Ligand SMILES: O=C1NS(=O)(=O)c2ccccc21
């Protein structure tokens with residue numbers, strides 16, 4: 001039927017409705033650290049999030065997302081491998097049922113407990129619908145989560161998840177500052193890829209940060225209490241909403257750091 005992460009509608013099935021699933025620049029990938037190429041021409045990232053305006057938090061049946069006002073250049077990503085200005089639209093997570101899985105990208109086949117995606121779109125295309133039709137339309141900042149100490153900047157998100165437990169629920173979520181989710185270092189890997197969910201469009205420049213953030217076991221446990229199902233349907237816990245690594249094919253992963 002409609003796509004998801006179960007036995008009968010999971011990532012192995014998606015190609016029947018979205019044939020680009022078997023395409024040439026699909027994501028995620030496994031980032032072999034010994035094969036990645038250091039590119040000294042790569043610039044530092046510029047992350048300008050001080051004027052970010054968060055709007056809502058929503059359970060969309062596949063993850064939960066926080067949306068931002070992208071009507072002007074308030075929260076933007078520039079630099080790195082990018083040409084031009086990319087506006088922050090939303091962030092969301094992918095996570096596991098157990099601490100040793102949940103990330104989409106892997107590093108030397110190591111999985112992390114979760115992965116944060118900050119989705120941005122290229123303002124030269126005017127709106128995000130147009131941007132997803134272009135090979136340089138989106139830039140996604142990917143951040144790994146490991147279980148350790150708590151991340152205080154994540155706690156405002158954890159505490160509202162009760163209010164959006166089931167598919168289709170949303171809540172007001174204003175004045176959230178996404179700078180509290182960033183690691184110390186902005187060293188990164190980058191490669192050309194795709195959305196990791198349908199429609200799997202090949203429109204993404206991936207920027208995957210080397211340094212994970214730490215979250216506590218209690219914080220991640222709250223992800224795992226969300227539901228895939230709508231209210232009044234049989235309860236299915238929202239866990240393991242990650243797509244496995246795809247073949248690299250004719251791509252090179254570049255590193256900003258030696
Ligand atoms: O689920 C997703 N992972 S992603 O960052 O590739 C992305 C981009 C746009 C819409 C959804 C999604």
Ligand SMILES: [Zn+2]
Pocket residue numbers: 092093094117196
């Ligand atoms: Zn994602």
